[PDB]
Structure formats: structure tokens, C-alpha cells
């Protein structure tokens, strides 16, 4: 197991994790927008 | 300071930052769930 294999596997883990953190943010941004609409309605 | 040293240090920064962004998300997901419970209770 070379240094480049370690770097590649770290980069791959990071990219997979970044996509998951983005998905979680989008879910939470929808939830916050729903609360904001509830507190803002007439 | 070689190119590989730069790549390694970038990867290490990114992995540390990813763990912190995850912790912040978990804190905020608990806060949003608490608000959702407050707006949903009988």
C-alpha cells in the first residue's frame, strides 16, 4: 500500500463525505424554510 | 517542501474541517428538531 494509494483513498472518502454533508444541508435548509414560513404567515 | 507534502497537508486540513462541519451540523439538527417539536406539540 503506497503513499499515493493512501492519498487517493483519503480524497475519495472526502468527496463521498462532502456529498453527504451537502445533502444533509439541503434537507435542513428545507426544514428551516418551512419553519420560517410558519412564523411569517398571516 | 515537496508537492506530496503539500497534498498531504491539504488532505489533512480537509479531513479535520470535515469533522468540524459534521459536528456543527449535528448541533444544528438537534436545534431544528427542538424547534419542530415546539411547533408540533399539542
Amino acid at each position, epitope marked *: 500500500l503506497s503513499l499515493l494509494d493512501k492519498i487517493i483513498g*483519503a480524497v475519495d*472518502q472526502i468527496q463521498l463525505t462532502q456529498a453527504q454533508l451537502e445533502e444533509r444541508q439541503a434537507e435542513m435548509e428545507g426544514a428551516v424554510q418551512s419553519i420560517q414560513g410558519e412564523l411569517s404567515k398571516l | 517542501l515537496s508537492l506530496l507534502d503539500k497534498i498531504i497537508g491539504a488532505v489533512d486540513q480537509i479531513q479535520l474541517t470535515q*469533522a468540524q462541519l459534521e459536528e456543527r451540523q449535528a448541533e444544528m439538527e438537534g436545534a431544528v428538531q427542538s424547534i419542530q417539536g415546539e411547533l408540533s406539540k399539542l
Partner: nanobody
Framework: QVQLQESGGGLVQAGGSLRLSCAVSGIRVNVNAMYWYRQAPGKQRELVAI???????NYADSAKGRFTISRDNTKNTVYLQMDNLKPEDTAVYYC?????????WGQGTQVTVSS
């Protein structure tokens, strides 16, 4: 699949020490950042410690210098040494990699600290 087999918990007195182990299969611990979490009854899962691919560490504030994460690359195993334990550390402890936390959790290892 990824396998996570946690061990080393038990019943310990306050001020005591434990060393948790997580034996990993299906990913390499010297390639992937690895995390320890804990979950107390009825509470949200808390990140405790992280070790990066190239061996940097960070800890939750609740560890406050008491915990040490490490790994053995040959045994593909991650460790959490926990010193000066307190009742507030009672929880089930879990190891995972960040890319799988949405997907799978092992059974964990129960830690109970009594005064």
C-alpha cells in the same frame, strides 16, 4: 459490506481507565479517517474523537484531554483510550467512518462509570 466490531467497554469506577477497540473490515484504517461517537440513553449521538488518514487528531470538548484515539494498521483496528472517567461518560460507544454514518452502525460497546 463494512464491518465494525466494538469492544473494551464494561463497568469501571470513576477515575478509572478503559481502552476501547473497533476491529474494522472492508475499509483500511490507514486510508480512511475514523471516528468514535457515543450515545447516552435518550440523547443524540455525540462525536467524541477523530483520527485523520495522516494521523492528526481532534477531540470533543467533553474529552478535555482525557481521551486518546489511535490505530493499529496491521490489525486494522481503531482504539480509544479513556482516562479519568466520570459518571457523565456513561454511554454506548461506536466507531465509524464518516462516509457510512448514514448507512450502518455497529452494535457499540457499553461503558458504565460508577462512583
Amino acid at each position: 459490506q463494512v464491518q465494525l466490531q466494538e469492544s473494551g467497554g464494561g463497568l469501571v469506577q470513576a477515575g478509572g481507565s478503559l481502552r476501547l477497540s473497533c476491529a474494522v473490515s472492508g475499509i483500511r484504517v490507514n486510508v480512511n479517517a475514523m471516528y468514535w461517537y457515543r450515545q447516552a440513553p435518550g440523547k443524540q449521538r455525540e462525536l467524541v474523537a477523530i483520527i485523520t488518514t495522516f494521523g492528526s487528531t481532534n477531540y470533543a470538548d467533553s474529552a478535555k484531554g482525557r481521551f486518546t484515539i489511535s490505530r493499529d494498521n496491521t490489525k486494522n483496528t481503531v482504539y480509544l483510550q479513556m482516562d479519568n472517567l466520570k459518571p457523565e461518560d456513561t454511554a454506548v460507544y461506536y466507531c465509524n467512518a464518516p462516509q457510512f454514518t448514514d448507512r450502518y452502525w455497529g452494535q457499540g460497546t457499553q461503558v458504565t462509570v460508577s462512583s
